[PDB]
């Protein structure tokens, strides 16, 4: 008997409430719910209608700027799940700056299968700090709580006693409350999310949230899995296939749903694997009668034609519409602003696209570790450059370390150059290997990949200083290393000791006492050349060490400058600039001596 | 084979002019 | 030019012996 | 009956001694003196020659790589003065790496005129810590005693006594001192520089260093100012003729040069002011007969054609070749490394030069803190340019802050673009007046000038915060300003507000303690909008505080980025990137939010 | 006349449309 | 882009007016 109701596209609600209980008829919503900037309503209107047949809503709930809102207690008592099929800027549920909101109370809300909440500007927001967000998503790290008057006044909150289980979140039992007369139910953990009805009972599998019976996929609010004739089930039995991700249609609904968008104006829902898909796949096409793509001889690949060709990618709204296309016909400008690792739903997107027809820029995308998202790109083409004549563009990505992986990736660059200048944590190393991979066919000028602003977060100076002689026994520590010299010896100022006291076996790079030491005596002889090192003053018995040196040299344009760094080992138990500049004033002293004094025959 | 430079320019002349 | 020649390049002997006017 | 002996060119002095001691009848040099590598000498045939005769060295003495010569006393036991007319990489007196010299004993000299000394690498060189260095350099910041024996060993030196005078130079009497046998004569500081003949006496003006007798211009061993038959005089009296700053020559002597080079190759010698300058200077040519450079009608400009069109600019020495000429017909790539301030012998030497016809390169100059050197360059053509098509190259000059002075300064740039990157103390306000007074042919493209890092030295946010209250009691700072807003109000981060314990008057931009005040609200309205300021704990009565506030705000690629900072202002008495980015994808959300949901008639 | 932006835009809108 | 139009640049009251069937 569950969804008693028919099934409301998405809809978009402005201005006034006729439409908001236009929705009296609605057990399930195909699409988004916006209840949308209305100004003519105070908190008198709200209290006589109620939707409480509205069981779950496939894509998202967004609230923006509606006054007189005081609770969504009667808005929206059966709420159970909000999926994520379709995001609104990777926030599954966005309550923005709307006013006069006192409490959230959608206690029948148990799960949000894709997406985050982004609660924020509710400046008369209470009971907000007692929400599960751990039993209803699953994936809490975009959560972002920010700007409620939970954060600027004291509220107070009560709950309903005599009772209503705490659960520990940071080490403490504090609350696990809804409003002043609801709580969320917690049920055992022996069950993921499988229903549990009041007691310890976990429902089938085939049963999301809340059930009201013992086992029984036919006898529950919510399927997890595909809904089928009131029965929930697994993937559609024949002659049934799957639609949107939520129902089994027969054969029947996807032939009218064609017919109508073939001539009225749309999505044109052909079948493919059992699934009815929008557009057939790549690889694939439609011919007539029968909705099948079947495979198609010439290989056919599927595109998606920007508007303008030039596209902006932020989140996961925008990366989604670039889903199941290999060539695009544009540009992307990647920029991901903000402090989370946006990585497996843009590897899922935006990871089959093979061609872009123009520039990859990378701007301002902070938390950006990796470009392995297009583990499938293979030709970046460059018929639509940028200013400047750019094909790769690459700002101040300030967490990006490691570009496409070039031992396993190919790619064919064509007709541009690069454009690396001030990302801090990567290297000029990965650069001139992509150079050398790619085979850039512009041949980049001066300037165009920052030398030394390129490199100044991250010690990659690509070498490594053998220990040779290390003896402890009680306060002393003793280092004889491997000498090493540039191809100009007057340019290595010293090395840079670096040890920290860590008895804990995982230490990372650059707290960390710095000394420096001086350079040892160019012999130009096979000895000794009295293996710099150094003996560290201060050690008490039985703690570990962790110890790496870096090289110190002056810089050099016309060069990627030349350096050194040891392994980070483990020792068991037992004024910058000015002496950079004096060192480079006695080079070009003795430069200058030697170039006036040694002259060949006139 | 190397770069001489500095101080070794200076004491390699002298074995080449010598 | 002679740290030109000899310290970012690679000079041979026949250039050492021609900047061997220097000394003598 | 000084300078008993003839005038000695300029020598080079390599393999033996047989010249070194062709000097044996030289009172003066007129050039340089080169006692460059001699390697089969040793420590017992320096003994016999000695040259007592040699009184002063007109323009330096150079040193380098000479083995077994144990002291300087015998082999130049009266040098009194050596002049700075041609110096050797802005240094008046080099001694490298040459070994085996004990000790300088230079007991004789008394000033240099001009230059500086740079002593180094001497790895048996004692007697260094007592020489004068304050009463024979009168310019002492380029003196570069650095890598002796005195700074590596104790060499504990002795020295006559019985008894001879020590100075204060940083606070004690530590010694004078020259050698083990010699001292060097102080005396009294009434007159600056003009003999004391061993008691207190000082002679005439004429007469430098040392004197025998009382005052009589006649009798001294070195003249200050010009020399005449036998008697230091001034200014030559006719029918004299000066010549190369320090003799007095009659007509016939610049006849005989002038005809000696005119066919047998060379400094033609002409007669200009009474001086027998190699060249008539700018705006007058030679006729014939009579050496004289008589004005010539329709202005005639002196040009220094350059090598290959192409000049390095590090010392002195090099730009002392661009003296005289107004038009350069090459390029200037002024290099000035080291931690001296190079100002005034660049603008008396490389100051008349009105047209560049190349580009004015500046590579890596440190210590270079305006580009007042060309106060008379009118006119940088674009005839040859660099790589790029840049007409004015500006790598990072670390301490360059202002350029031409852009109120009384010209400039007509033609056929170049400008590079300016990397400059840390620089501003842009400064480069964008130089980009609207000069008017640039070339139009530079995107990131030919850095916007953002090439002014993160030194805070020219080019606004005023005027402060409005102040009321300071015994323990409570209080203040009140004029509130600012970027003309997005979302940028403001807040006021970062500065204060330091300082009772002293002289007080200069950024210890210095920061706090963090939020913006006021956005009341929009002319109220009093909260007036930000602050309230700081901690306070003792009767000091002096310095204050001065700067303003926090997003980067913005697509402009220069606002800002504000009052003036320091004196009271009498009584996780840096994470915020950015954080405020950064909030204005992105909203910004996103209201692109969606506000949409023009469809 | 100013540079509306953020909570301003959707609360000027507002007199605007009205 | 009524953020591109309305807060980069100034816009008037006519492409408000325009902008009025957001909320209506
Ligand atoms: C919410 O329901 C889903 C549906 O099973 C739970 O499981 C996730 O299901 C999605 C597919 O819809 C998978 O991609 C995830 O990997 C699943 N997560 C798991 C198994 O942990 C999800 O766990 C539920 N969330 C909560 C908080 O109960
Ligand atoms: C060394 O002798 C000179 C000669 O008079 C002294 O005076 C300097 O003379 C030059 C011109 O040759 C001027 O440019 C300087 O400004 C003069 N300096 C003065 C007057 O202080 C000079 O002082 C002497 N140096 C010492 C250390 O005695
Ligand atoms: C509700 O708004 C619509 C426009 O969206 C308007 O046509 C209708 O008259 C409004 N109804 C009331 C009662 O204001
Ligand atoms: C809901 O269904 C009932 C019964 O068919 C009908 O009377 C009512 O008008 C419907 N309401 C809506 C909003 O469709
Ligand atoms: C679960 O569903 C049953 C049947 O609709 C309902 O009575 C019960 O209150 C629900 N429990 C919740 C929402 O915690
Ligand atoms: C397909 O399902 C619809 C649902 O209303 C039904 O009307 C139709 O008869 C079905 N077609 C077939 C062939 O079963
Ligand atoms: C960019 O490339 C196009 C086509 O090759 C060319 O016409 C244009 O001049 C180029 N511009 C620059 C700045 O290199
Ligand atoms: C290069 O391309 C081949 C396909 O020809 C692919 O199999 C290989 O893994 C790629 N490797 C690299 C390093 O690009
Ligand atoms: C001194 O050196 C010159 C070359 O500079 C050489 O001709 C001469 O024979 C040398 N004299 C001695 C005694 O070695
Ligand atoms: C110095 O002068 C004397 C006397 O004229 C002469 O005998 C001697 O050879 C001269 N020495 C030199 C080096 O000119
Ligand atoms: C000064 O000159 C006289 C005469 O030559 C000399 O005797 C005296 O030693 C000199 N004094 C010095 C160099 O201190
Ligand atoms: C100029 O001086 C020289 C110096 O030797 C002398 O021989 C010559 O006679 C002088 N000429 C005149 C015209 O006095
Ligand atoms: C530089 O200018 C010259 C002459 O105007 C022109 O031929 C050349 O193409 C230019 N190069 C660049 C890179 O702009
Ligand atoms: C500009 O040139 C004139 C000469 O015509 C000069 O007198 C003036 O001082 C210069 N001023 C500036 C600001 O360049």
Known sequence: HLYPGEVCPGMDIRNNLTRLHELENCSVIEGHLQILLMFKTRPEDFRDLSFPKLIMITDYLLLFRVYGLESLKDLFPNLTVIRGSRLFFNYALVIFEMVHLKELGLYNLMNITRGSVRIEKNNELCYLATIDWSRILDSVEDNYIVLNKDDNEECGDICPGTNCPATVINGQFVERCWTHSHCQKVCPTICKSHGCTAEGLCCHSECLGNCSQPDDPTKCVACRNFYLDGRCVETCPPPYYHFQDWRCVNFSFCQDLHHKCKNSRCHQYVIHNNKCIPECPSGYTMNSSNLLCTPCLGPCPKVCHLLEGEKTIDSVTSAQELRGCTVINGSLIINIRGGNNLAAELEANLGLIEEISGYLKIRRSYALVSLSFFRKLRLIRGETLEIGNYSFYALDNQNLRQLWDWSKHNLTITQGKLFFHYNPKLCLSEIHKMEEVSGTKGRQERNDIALKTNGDQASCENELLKFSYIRTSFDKILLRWEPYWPPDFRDLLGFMLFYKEAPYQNVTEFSWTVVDIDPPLRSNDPKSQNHPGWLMRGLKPWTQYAIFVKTLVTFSDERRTYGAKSDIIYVQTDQILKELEESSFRKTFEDYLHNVVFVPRP | ?18 | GIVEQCCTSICSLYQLENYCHSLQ
């Open chain 2, 1 to 18: 084979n190397q770069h001489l430079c500095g101080s070794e320019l200076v004491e390699a002349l002298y074995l080449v002019c010598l």
